[PDB]
């Protein structure tokens, strides 16, 4: 019955991180005709419903409605359910998106009817975006030959932090030692992440709208030297990290169209576009919308590591020959999202989040090694946290969006075979809604945020575990609670703390105190040795600060 929506369509701490295709939602669409027994929506009504669908529903159900974390909603199925059921079900609204920009999920009576009617109609597929379109958008502002041959500014590049100023479609380059904002660059679109070339010279940013900008950090005044659009919705980018392939390539991953694109690392020239449409690994059924999630770069082979979400495939893409393209399509687990390499940089550990599993790939051998349930609900590691547990040896950790647990997996087949690829411990942190866990080789602490927790005090704090004191005896390791938001001294709203990121020396860890566009935000720097406040960064230009990426730690994959 429609009342089932109370368990499926309400907001959880772990169902707020699904795609909001708000850039694609801006495209106008033609209203389809309606077959017998179905009523057509006008052009305005259809577009209104389509916008809501793309912004709020497509993340879980797909723009093509073939299903993702939520079931398929194709016309054959919806027509059988009927308008009445749909209307009653949709009245409850849908899960809220991310705080500080996402939807509340609430719908008016008029919107409810629009959505019910929209679901009964046949949807068209949004436009593709291929080479012609990419080349049209491709602009090389400063040709390689016109760029410096050595660093021309006096900045400490490796200790620089590239910070997303989300809603303003800008990034701030901040000195990691003095905390001075060296520059604020416009990208004209919300940047999702910053990635660095292996040499650390080139800064790449990917906008949610599919726009890629590459910045030359050696310039007297660093700016975008090249840009290109690779799709309509994208969230991932990475650079080549195999020795000998430094600065050779960059790769971007898109949600729509479902594809990844390999670009020249110096000019962004689009070299190879690969569709991710394909078969699910387990039921082996065609899926028309397998989104690219995290993309990492192998340190063992000249390959990119691409997570394809809906089909549960991890692709190892060899970039040594883009014409005779070698790839290894690894059957893993559905709903692959993020992950990171272990301390040795040999194994890729990734969260198939909706299924509570960690998938482990051996990047040297190019094969699946393990799939283990974390015991928690919806793991979201970011790139995770590698450390040497006093008892267990090398481990990689992840926290969860669905509960307060932190899980550790052994990552040393050679030295600790009995612990390898096994969940060794699970213990509580602040609460549910965590997004990022962090540590550094020079730190004895493990930091865990709780960004999406519904309690302001919790979402504004961070749990810190003392790795040195961990025994792994089965008890719950104690943690210190750092009042990060409180330290920032922000009066308005309930700012959420998100994502720890260390400086190059691994002596200070930064957190974003994230408030909405029309509210006050800040960055808080914590002295890692003492766990005391080091500095609070505030500036009128620091609007909606979210992701932060230290140049050195990003270029070297140190986490």
Active site residues: 57, 60-61, 98, 337, 380
Give dist(CA 333, CA 313) in Å, integer: 7
Give dist(CA 306, CA 298) in Å, integer: 10
CB contact at 8 A, 54 and 26 = no
Our CB check for ligand DHE shows the closer of 65 and 192 to be 192
Distance of CA 394 to the CA centre of its chain: 25
What are the residues facing 227 on neighbouring strands?
A: 139, 213
| Binding window for ligand DHE (CB under 6 A); candidates: 3-11, 16-24, 261-269, 398-406 | 16-24
With binding defined as CB under 8 A, does residue 325 bind its own copies?
yes
What is the contact mask toward its own copies in residues 22 to 51, using x (rule: CB under 8 A)? Answer: --------xxxxxxx-x-x--x--------
Closest approach, Cβ 293 to ligand DHE, in A, equals 4
Structure tokens at 309: 């979400």
With binding defined as CB under 8 A, does residue 273 bind its own copies?
yes
Distance of CA 292 to the CA centre of its chain: 10
| Binding window for its own copies (CB under 8 A); candidates: 87-95, 341-349, 362-370, 518-526 | 362-370
Which of ligand DHE, its own copies, ligand HEC, none does residue 164 bind to, with CB < 5 to 8 Å depending on kind?
A: ligand DHE
Residue 122 parent element (H or E): none
Locate tokens 């590591």: which residue? Answer: 305
Instruction: Check residue 82 and give left, alpha or beta (phi > 0: left; psi -120 to 50: alpha).
Output: left
For residue 518, what are the CA distances in angstroms to 18, 253, 319, 521, 542?
Answer: 24, 31, 44, 9, 11
Confirm or deny that 57 is annotated as ligand binding.
yes
Distance of CA 83 to the CA centre of its chain: 36
Residues 72-131 that bind its own copies (CB under 8 A): 121-122, 124, 128, 130-131
The residue within the footprint of ligand HEC, chosen from 21, 24, 57, 190 (CB under 6 A), is 57
Our CB check for ligand HEC shows the closer of 56 and 438 to be 56
Q: For residue 408, give the nearest of 451, 453, 349 by alpha carbon.
A: 349
The residue within the footprint of its own copies, chosen from 28, 154, 283, 418 (CB under 8 A), is 283
Kindly report whether the peptide bond that precedes residue 462 is cis, defined as omega within 30 degrees of 0. Answer: no
Other C-beta atoms within 10 Å of 48: how many?
Answer: 17
Confirm or deny that 299 is annotated as ligand binding.
no
CB contact at 8 A, 121 and 34 = yes
Our CB check for ligand DHE shows the closer of 16 and 389 to be 16
With binding defined as CB under 6 A, does residue 378 bind ligand DHE?
no
What are the residues facing 510 on neighbouring strands?
A: 501, 525
Q: What 3-state class would DSSP assign to 252? A: strand
Closest approach, Cβ 354 to ligand DHE, in A, equals 13
CB contact at 8 A, 94 and 105 = yes
Our CB check for ligand HEC shows the closer of 56 and 313 to be 56
Strand ranges (E), 365-404? 367-373, 385-389, 393-399
> What length does the chain have?
559
Other C-beta atoms within 10 Å of 522: how many?
Answer: 22
Closest approach, Cβ 251 to ligand DHE, in A, equals 10
Residues 70-99 that bind ligand HEC (CB under 6 A): 70-71, 73, 81, 86, 89-90, 94-95
CB neighbour list of residue 34: distance below 8 Å, 6 or more residues apart: 40, 120, 121
With binding defined as CB under 6 A, does residue 64 bind ligand HEC?
no
How many residues touch ligand DHE under the rule CB under 6 A: the total is 23
Q: For residue 239, give the nearest of 252, 227, 226, 228 by alpha carbon.
A: 252
With binding defined as CB under 8 A, does residue 326 bind its own copies?
yes
Closest approach, Cβ 64 to ligand HEC, in A, equals 14
With binding defined as CB under 6 A, does residue 236 bind ligand DHE?
yes
With binding defined as CB under 8 A, does residue 321 bind its own copies?
yes
Our CB check for ligand HEC shows the closer of 94 and 187 to be 94
| Binding window for ligand DHE (CB under 6 A); candidates: 46-54, 79-87, 230-238, 405-413 | 230-238
The residue within the footprint of ligand DHE, chosen from 166, 201, 313, 380 (CB under 6 A), is 166
Which of ligand HEC, ligand DHE, its own copies, none does residue 328 bind to, with CB < 5 to 8 Å depending on kind?
A: its own copies
| Positions at the binding site for heme d1 | 17, 20, 101, 166, 192, 195, 208, 235, 255, 383, 499, 546
Q: By CB under 6 A, name the binding residues for ligand HEC.
A: 8-9, 15, 18, 56-57, 59-61, 69-71, 73, 81, 86, 89-90, 94-95, 115
């Amino acid at each position: 019955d429609p009342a089932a929506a109370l368990e499926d369509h309400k907001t959880r701490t772990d169902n707020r991180y699904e795609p909001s295709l708000d850039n694609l939602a801006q495209q106008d669409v033609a209203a389809p005709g309606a077959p017998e027994g179905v009523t057509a929506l006008s052009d305005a009504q259809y577009n209104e419903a389509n916008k809501i669908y793309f912004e709020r529903c497509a993340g879980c159900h797909g723009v093509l409605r073939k299903g993702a974390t939520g079931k398929a909603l194709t016309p054959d199925l919806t027509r059988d359910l009927g308008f009445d059921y749909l209307q009653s079900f949709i009245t409850y609204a849908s899960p809220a998106g991310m705080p500080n920009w996402g939807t509340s999920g609430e719908l008016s009576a008029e919107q409810v009817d629009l959505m019910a009617n929209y679901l009964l109609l046949d949807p068209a597929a949004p436009p593709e975006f291929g080479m012609k379109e990419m080349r049209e958008s491709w602009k090389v502002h400063v040709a390689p030959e016109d760029r410096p041959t050595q660093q021309m500014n006096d900045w400490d590049l490796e200790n620089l932090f590239s910070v997303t100023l989300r809603d303003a479609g800008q990034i701030a380059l901040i000195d990691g030692s003095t905390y001075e904002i060296k520059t604020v660059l416009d990208t004209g679109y919300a940047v999702h992440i910053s990635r660095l070339s292996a040499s650390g010279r080139y800064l790449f940013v990917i906008g949610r709208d599919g726009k890629v900008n590459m910045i030359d950090l050696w310039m007297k005044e660093p700016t975008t030297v090249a840009e290109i659009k690779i799709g309509s919705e994208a969230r991932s980018i990475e650079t080549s990290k195999m020795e000998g392939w430094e600065d050779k390539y960059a790769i971007a991953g898109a949600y729509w169209p479902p594809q990844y694109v390999i670009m020249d690392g110096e000019t962004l020239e689009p070299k190879k576009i690969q569709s991710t449409r394909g078969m699910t690994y387990d039921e082996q059924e065609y899926h028309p919308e397998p989104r690219v999630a995290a993309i990492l770069a192998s340190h063992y082979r000249p390959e990119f590591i691409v997570n394809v979400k809906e089909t549960g495939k991890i692709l190892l893409v060899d970039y040594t020959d883009l014409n005779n393209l070698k790839t290894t399509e690894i059957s893993a687990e559905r709903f692959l999202h993020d992950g990171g390499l272990d301390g040795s940089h040999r194994y890729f550990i990734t969260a198939a989040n909706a299924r509570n599993k960690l998938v482990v790939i051996d990047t040297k051998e190019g094969k699946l090694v393990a799939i283990e349930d974390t015991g928690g609900q919806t793991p979201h590691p970011g790139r995770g946290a590698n450390f040497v547990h006093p008892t267990f040896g090398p481990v990689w950790a992840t926290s969860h969006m669905g509960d307060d647990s932190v899980a550790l997996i052994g990552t040393d087949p050679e030295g600790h075979p009995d612990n390898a690829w096994k969940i060794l411990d699970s213990f509580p942190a602040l609460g549910g809604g965590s997004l990022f866990i962090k540590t550094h080789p020079n730190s004895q602490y493990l930091y865990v945020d709780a960004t999406l927790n519904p309690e302001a005090e919790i979402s504004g704090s961070v749990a810190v575990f003392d790795i040195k004191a961990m025994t792994g005896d089965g008890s719950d390791p104690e943690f210190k609670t750092l009042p990060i938001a409180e330290w920032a001294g922000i009066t308005e709203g309930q700012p959420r703390v998100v994502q720890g990121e260390f400086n190059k020396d691994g002596t200070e860890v930064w957190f974003s105190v994230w408030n909405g566009k029309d509210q006050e935000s800040a960055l808080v720097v914590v002295d890692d040795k003492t766990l005391e406040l080091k500095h609070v960064i505030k500036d009128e230009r620091l609007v909606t600060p979210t992701g932060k990426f230290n140049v050195y730690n990003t270029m070297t994959d140190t986490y």
